[PDB]
Design a protein around this ligand. Structure first.
Ligand SMILES: [Zn+2]
Ligand SMILES: [Zn+2]
Ligand SMILES: [Zn+2]
Ligand SMILES: [Zn+2]
Lengths: 160, 132, 82, 68, 45, 39, 40, 97, 241, 116, 48, 147
């Protein structure tokens, strides 16, 4: 669905003293650290950030730390999969205890057989024991059906 | 003649165990109007410590580091019990699930004040210090 | 609260006896933590006196805030103080 | 491993003379006696750059810090 | 923590004590320790 | 701290813009999510 | 004990005025160099 | 006292106030019910006065509550209950008046 | 508190009214932190070379992450190696702990001994009025094991110089030491706060021989005049001239 | 001949250096992968930069008066061309060398003549 | 405060009219007139 | 001829888990006290030695502590010649979901040609390094290279 989110947040950034010539320098310096790392304040993973502008306060310096602090406004791109609704992924590993899916080619999904309706069955091949087809109740085979659509619980669910 | 760079700290209040500075000297340093020197000599050199607080509930003891979220992963983000009730939720050292108590910050303050809060909680009287 | 406009500033235009002290303190701190120096060194080694050479020419950032007991405050650039 | 500078028998250093002799057989069509152009009058410090195994160019293709 | 090397993927992993051990990017289960800078002195003999 | 509404195309154009502004592995998986979303 | 219990009943809020109360919370005093603030 | 610390808070105001019975429940982690202190095993009895969920004991114990050693566990309070309620001995004169 | 010695005092007329002469023992047992820049690099490195058992050696190292390498067990070889690498990016990640990368900008903190430019607090119990606790410059003397200061401070501290010991404090950070250096430096405590009357100054012997010499009946050849003028000046120990 | 012998340090051995006895050189190279490579030619001299730690990379570090005493005759490795080691993308070598006066029958490296 | 001028420290020579008027040239540069007169008002209060 | 021996030992914690308890020991140090006189000089922080640090016989190699007891144990170098360590290896104990219960240290021992070792041409003509004659007391050809 529309699981993508962009949110302009305001943070209390710690400007190093050596980058006193330009704050934007040290701002992006650690801003490149937040990317792809979960911002727990919003409980999502940083995907993009722009509009690096500070509420101009000529940052107040700590009482005993030379690196100062200031409030800055930036616009994050967190992706919130908070068990909202139907999402979809490409299956990468398939074995009759859980299914491994990739959402957006990055994030992982382990839908266990219990959250899967019992009616679907697995075939355990000859070349591979576990790398095989969790053929659905319908009999439709799932590997070439690389995309699987499902609902999220937090972690996935196939039971209807 | 007794030098002391450092050494043992107290059992209760983590003070260098039994040199004296204060309670008349304080008058001296504040007479010079030399605040940083005062906070340096009596807070920094004596007992310096970082402690969390629940920003909303304003209590300093209802704080607790979250427990056993996943593998080493990210940091165990501390939480508040008083302000509390999948990623957000967490558990207890005994296993009690919870959620909330997120607004938590880290503050510098002398540990002896922490001891005071302890023995004052021992009276059911407690302060609710807020922060910005 | 309010920030006092630059136009109307009643605080003493003088560098107070305390203001020089705290200013040089933090300028030593910055310089000691690998901050850019805006004055040529003369072989100087103490990170702190270097800030003295900086102030002597008043070539120094780090404006100061003077808080009125009411709740207002002035923002004086170090170059603007006497 | 590497061509052993300062040969055992002779006292001549030879560690310089490895790639300079390699690109003699390589593209000069002269046989091993290109080392005669190198100036190894004896046989002693001569038999080094002749039959030295440069195994290390094959060992170096084993960085686990290859990042690939 | 400790910083190690995923054997195949060649990726710094930053694992901590009492932890499942595997490459985080590829999933490998064997990792070496990097060589820190440690003063050692030798004779030339 | 606040949120706003958004759809997928502006997310794609903003991601493109983001690949443009900031200039490794981060950008690699970004390339991955890019070729994942499009087409 | 006495001032303690009295402040406990009503619960009067000092911000923190005297550098002593400033001191018990570790922060610097409002006097001297610690009266003003320095910026960037 | 480290110069590299980023402490961003500011204690703005302290305010006093008594806590009710309900909040003591929410903060406390344990309850002591066993007047026994240590066992023959010399070890803190669970629910006992040296509860390792109250805090890490010495000899390199890890807190049952915070699951960390004594270096980082700030200690987690407990509570002991009584259906008596007797008045508070400080407010005794004020209560009686 | 920590970082504060306690010793018996004896006066000295050679050193300064400002500086306090300290035995080398304390210069070893009193050390304070210091970030290392590029230009002060050679000094700090030299102090680290000298080691923790020889003035003006360095105590030991603190990494940018916050850990603390000692220096007593090492040998001067290992000292040398650690010193040469005392300034270099050693953090094995842009932010080794987590995604909070300000650690890339921190420096290696060298704990160094005290030296001739250091500002260390002097005080006396009981400290009634603010000139009873001041800030003094440091000069390290060799030989004696007793802290030395000038007479002119006797009056302000009112100490009778019979054995009454003192507390000797040292500010850790740079702002505190600058503040002691500029506001409450001993040289800035010349007029007592009660009334404007100065209390620091010369005493019995100085006033006596000053009376004698100043009397117009005096005379000096070139030898005496030069020797005496230099004897008072000694600019080198002060510098600036 | 411009040097004075090294008193080999008996127990109590650490501080036995000076500037009239010994000399110090240094090197430190991390073979970086070179990005200007077109295709696969496992030279690897052009595939990687600084893959070969030569002798020309042992820089003399003066020790005080030495810098002046040999300002007319700056000291160097006499063969700046020898390959000392070989490196590849990622790895690094960093060290410094201490050289003194010694007699050949103590170690062969002290025998100056190649062939007599 | 307390007849604002200052506590004793810098109010000892205010009474010493003669010694101020004696030299006044070390003092005029010590006070750095050229900078002070720049940003301060003088004639309003001197008139009132 | 420059002899270089590779003696590779592994250590495993499951063997000292006889029965009755789960995995209890973990490599490194019980959080708190730690011997510096030898251990911190050799063991890095993980209870694992520095990469390339010279060892001797009476020298700890690795450190694991018991959980319950909370006390540090140690492993010494059985061998009786100075050996370094060329690499240490954290063996994933199993398929996964296993703490590092096996470590592998590869010690490199140096053996130059020493008095008492054997040489042989490719004809069975074995010999023994007797004295390592001084290179100048050796005869020489008219070209002069020494035998
Ligand atoms: Zn709360
Ligand atoms: Zn030869
Ligand atoms: Zn891997
Ligand atoms: Zn706990």
């Amino acid at each position: 669905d529309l699981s993508l989110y962009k949110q302009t947040v305001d943070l209390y950034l710690s400007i190093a003293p050596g980058h006193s010539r330009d704050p934007l320098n040290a701002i992006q310096e650690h801003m490149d650290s937040m990317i792809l790392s979960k911002l727990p304040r919003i409980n999502g993973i940083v995907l993009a950030y722009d509009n690096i502008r500070f509420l101009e306060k000529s940052a107040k310096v700590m009482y005993d730390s030379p690196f100062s602090f200031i409030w800055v406004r930036v616009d994050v791109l967190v992706f919130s999969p908070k068990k909202g609704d139907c999402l979809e992924g490409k299956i990468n590993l398939v074995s009759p205890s859980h299914i491994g899916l990739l959402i957006l080619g990055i994030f992982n999904a382990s839908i266990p057989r219990k959250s899967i309706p019992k009616d679907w069955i697995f075939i355990e091949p000859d070349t591979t024991e576990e790398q095989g087809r969790w053929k659905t109740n319908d009999g439709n085979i799932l590997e070439p059906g690389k995309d699987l659509e499902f609902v999220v619980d937090g972690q996935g669910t196939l039971a209807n | 003649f007794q030098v002391r760079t450092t050494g043992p700290i107290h059992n209760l209040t983590r003070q260098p165990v039994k040199i004296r500075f204060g309670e008349m000297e304080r008058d001296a340093v504040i007479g010079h109007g030399t605040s940083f020197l005062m906070q340096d000599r009596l807070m920094n050199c004596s007992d310096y410590a970082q402690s969390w607080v629940c920003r909303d509930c304003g209590s300093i003891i209802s704080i607790m580091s979250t427990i056993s979220m996943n593998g080493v992963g990210s940091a165990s983000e501390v939480r508040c019990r008083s302000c509390a009730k999948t990623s957000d939720i967490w558990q207890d050292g005994s296993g009690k699930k919870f959620v909330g108590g997120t607004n938590t910050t880290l503050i510098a303050l002398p540990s002896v004040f922490n001891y005071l809060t302890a023995e004052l909680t021992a009276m059911n009287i407690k302060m609710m210090l807020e922060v910005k | 609260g309010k920030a006092v406009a630059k136009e109307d500033r009643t605080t003493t235009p003088y560098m107070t006896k305390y203001e020089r002290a705290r200013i040089l303190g933090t300028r030593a701190l910055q310089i000691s933590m690998n901050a850019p120096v805006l004055v040529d060194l003369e072989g100087e080694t103490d990170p702190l006196q270097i800030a003295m050479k900086e102030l002597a020419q008043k070539k120094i950032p780090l404006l100061v805030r003077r808080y009125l007991p009411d709740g207002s405050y002035e923002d004086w650039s170090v170059a603007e103080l006497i | 491993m590497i061509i052993p500078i300062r040969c055992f028998s002779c006292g001549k250093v030879i560690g310089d003379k490895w790639d300079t002799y390699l690109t003699l057989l390589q593209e000069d069509n002269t046989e091993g006696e290109a080392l005669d152009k190198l100036g190894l009058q004896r046989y002693c410090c001569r038999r080094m750059i002749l039959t030295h195994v440069d195994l290390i160019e094959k060992l170096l293709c084993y960085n686990p810090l290859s990042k690939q | 923590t400790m910083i190690y090397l995923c054997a195949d993927c060649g990726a710094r992993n930053t694992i901590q004590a009492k932890e499942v051990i595997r490459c985080r990017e590829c999933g490998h289960r064997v990792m070496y320790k990097m060589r820190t800078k440690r003063m050692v002195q030798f004779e030339a003999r | 701290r606040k949120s706003e509404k958004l759809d997928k195309d502006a997310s794609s154009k903003f991601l493109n813009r983001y690949i443009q502004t900031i200039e490794e592995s981060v950008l690699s998986q970004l390339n991955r999510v890019l070729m994942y979303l499009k087409g | 004990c006495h001032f303690l219990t009295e402040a406990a009943l009503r619960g009067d809020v000092d911000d923190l005025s005297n550098p002593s109360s400033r001191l018990v919370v570790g922060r610097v005093g409002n006097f001297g160099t610690g009266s003003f603030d320095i910026f960037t | 006292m480290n110069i590299a610390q980023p402490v961003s808070s500011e204690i703005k105001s302290v305010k006093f106030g008594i806590y009710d019975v309900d909040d003591v429940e929410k903060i406390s982690v344990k309850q002591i019910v066993n007047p026994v202190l240590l066992d023959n095993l010399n070890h803190p009895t669970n629910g006992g006065l040296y509860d390792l969920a109250l805090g890490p004991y010495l000899k390199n114990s890890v807190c049952a509550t915070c699951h960390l050693d004594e270096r980082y566990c700030p200690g987690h309070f407990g509570h002991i209950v009584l259906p008596i309620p007797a008045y508070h001995p400080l407010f005794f004169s004020q209560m009686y008046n | 508190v920590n970082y504060a010695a306690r010793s018996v005092i004896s006066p000295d007329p050679n050193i300064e009214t400002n500086e306090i002469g300290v035995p080398p023992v304390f210069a070893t047992k009193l050390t304070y932190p210091e970030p290392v820049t590029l230009y002060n690099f050679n000094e700090m490195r030299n102090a680290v070379i000298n080691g923790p058992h020889k003035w003006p050696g360095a105590s030991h190292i603190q990494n940018e992450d916050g850990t603390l390498i000692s220096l007593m067990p090492l040998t001067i070889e290992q000292r040398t190696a650690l010193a040469n690498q005392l300034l270099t990016p050693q953090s094995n990640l842009i932010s080794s702990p987590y995604s909070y990368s300000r650690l890339i900008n921190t420096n290696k903190k060298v704990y160094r001994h005290v030296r001739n430019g250091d500002m260390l607090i002097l005080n006396r119990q009981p400290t009634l009025h603010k000139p009873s606790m001041m800030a003094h410059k440091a000069r390290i003397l060799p030989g004696e094991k007793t802290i030395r200061m000038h007479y002119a401070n006797c009056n302000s501290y009112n100490a009778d110089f019979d054995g009454d010991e003192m507390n000797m404090h040292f500010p850790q950070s740079t702002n505190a030491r600058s503040e002691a250096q500029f506001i409450a430096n001993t040289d800035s405590q010349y007029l007592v706060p009660t009334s404007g009357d100065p209390l620091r100054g010369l005493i019995q012997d100085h006033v006596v021989m000053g009376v004698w010499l100043t009397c117009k009946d005096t005379f000096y050849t070139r030898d005496e005049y030069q020797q005496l003028l230099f004897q008072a000046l000694k600019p080198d120990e002060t510098g600036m001239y | 001949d411009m040097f004075k012998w090294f008193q080999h340090p008996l127990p109590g051995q650490e501080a036995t250096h000076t500037d009239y006895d010994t000399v110090v050189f240094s090197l430190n190279k991390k073979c970086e992968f070179n990005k200007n490579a077109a295709t696969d030619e496992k030279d690897p001299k052009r595939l990687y930069v600084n893959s070969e730690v030569y002798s020309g990379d042992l820089i003399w570090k003066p020790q005080g008066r030495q810098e002046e005493r040999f300002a007319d005759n700056p000291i160097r490795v006499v063969n700046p061309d020898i390959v000392v080691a070989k490196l590849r993308p990622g790895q690094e070598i960093d060290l410094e060398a201490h050289a003194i006066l010694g007699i050949g029958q103590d170690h062969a490296k002290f025998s100056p003549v190649a062939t007599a | 405060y307390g007849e604002d001028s200052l506590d004793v420290t810098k109010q000892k020579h205010l009474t010493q009219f003669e010694f101020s008027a004696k030299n006044y040239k070390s003092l005029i540069q010590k006070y750095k007139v050229k900078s002070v007169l720049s940003a301060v008002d003088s004639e309003t209060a001197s008139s009132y | 001829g420059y002899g270089t021996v590779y003696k590779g030992e592994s250590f495993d914690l499951s063997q000292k888990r006889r029965r009755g308890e789960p995995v209890v020991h973990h490599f490194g140090f019980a959080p708190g006290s730690t011997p510096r006189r030898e251990w911190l000089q050799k063991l890095d922080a993980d209870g694992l030695p520095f990469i390339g640090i010279k060892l001797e016989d009476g020298d700890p190699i690795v450190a694991y502590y018991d959980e319950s007891t909370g006390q540090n144990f140690i492993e010494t170098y059985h061998g009786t010649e100075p050996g370094f360590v060329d690499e240490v290896r954290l063996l994933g104990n199993d398929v996964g979901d296993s703490e590092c219960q096996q470590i592998h240290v590869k010690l490199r021992i140096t053996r130059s040609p020493i008095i008492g070792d054997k040489f042989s041409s490719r004809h069975g003509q074995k010999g023994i390094c007797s004295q390592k004659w001084p290179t100048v007391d050796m005869p020489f050809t008219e070209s002069g290279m020494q035998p």
